[PDB]
Amino acid sequence: DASQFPQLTKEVGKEEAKVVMRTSQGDITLKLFPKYAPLAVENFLTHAKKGYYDNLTFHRVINDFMIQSGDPKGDGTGGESIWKGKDPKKDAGNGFVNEISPFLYHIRGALAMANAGANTNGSQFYINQNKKNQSKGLSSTNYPKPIISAYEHGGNPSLDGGYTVFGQVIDGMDVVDKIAATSINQNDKPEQDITITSIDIVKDYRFKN
């Protein structure tokens, strides 16, 4: 049943959040999945609300792979969770735990947390942009049928189980593709720093202790 996999519908469910990530290349609308990755969703929404991501660059842009942002240092070495130095129950100093779900996958459009090892989630996030038909390459036995089908349109299945997925692009995939396109023949294109202008929380979500 495709309804068990919330990335397969653009409709924002009762227990889903919604944001608009305004970028120098256009607006990307994402829904988030606090039911399955509550730490990554709270971390991202809280940083977004406080302006932590404002004017940050997409510091990694790799065509047919993913686009990545959320590093105040702009080179992949920085960023921290909202709990670093504040709540050791959530972040002991090196980041928060991965949140792997059998309902969420690195299909094209998936929003995920970057990490420097399992359970080192800070503030860096990436959007899966790959467009390769990944269906045949999958170990079918280990993937739900609806997800094998969805992987026809692209994704990074090698990342499944290793990184938290916590959202999905529901509008503006063309913007994600335009950002990714800047890595193609970059030797013949003008220098360009792509930035997040702001993140508008359309439908917030909050968490209980």
Numbering used by the authors: 60 to 268
Direct quotes from the study:
Here, we solved the protein structures of two secreted parvulin and two secreted cyclophilin-like peptidyl-prolyl isomerase (PPIase) ATP-independent chaperones found in gram-positive streptococcal species. Two types of ATP-independent extracellular PPIases exist in pathogenic streptococci: the parvulin and cyclophilin families. Unlike cytoplasmic PPIases, extracellular PPIases have canonical secretion signal peptides that allow for their translocation across the cell membrane via the Sec pathway. These chaperones are lipidated to the outer leaflet of the membrane and function in the space between the bacterial membrane and cell wall.
We then solved the crystal structures of SlrA homologs from S. pneumoniae (SpnSlrA) and S. pyogenes (SpyPpiA) to 1.88 Å and 1.28 Å resolution, respectively, using single-wavelength anomalous diffraction (SAD) data from selenomethionine derivatized crystals. Although the expression construct encodes residues 21–268, three residues of the purification tag and 39 N-terminal residues were disordered in the crystal; thus, only residues 60–268 could be resolved. Superimposition of chains A from the SpnSlrA and SpyPpiA structures confirms that their structures are homologous and share good alignment with an r.m.s.d. of 2.08 Å. The SpnSlrA and SpyPpiA proteins have a canonical cyclophilin fold comprised of eight antiparallel β-strands (SpnSlrA: β1, 72–81; β2, 82–90; β3, 112–120; β4, 121–127; β5, 166–173; β6, 181–188; β7, 221–227; β8, 250–260) that form a β-barrel with two α-helices (SpnSlrA: α1,95–108; α2, 230–240) located at the top and the bottom of the barrel. Both structures also contain extra secondary structural elements adjacent to the β-barrel composed of residues 189–212 (η2, 193–195; η3, 203–211; η4, 215–217). SpnSlrA putative active site residues Phe184 and His221 are identical to hCypA residues but are substituted by Tyr in SpyPpiA. Thus, we sought to determine whether these substitutions still allow for SpyPpiA PPiase activity. SpnSlrA, SpyPpiA, and hCypA all catalyzed the cis-to-trans isomerization of the N-succinyl-Ala-Ala-Pro-Phe-p-nitroanilide substrate. However, we observed ~20% decrease in PPIase activity of SpnSlrA and SpyPpiA compared to hCpyA. These data indicate that Tyr substitutions at key putative active site positions allow for PPIase activity in, at least, one streptococcal cyclophilin. Using affinity isothermal titration calorimetry (ITC), we determined that SpnSlrA and SpyPpiA bind to CsA with a dissociation constants (Kd) of 122.4 ± 41.4 nM and 365.7 ± 102.1 nM, respectively.
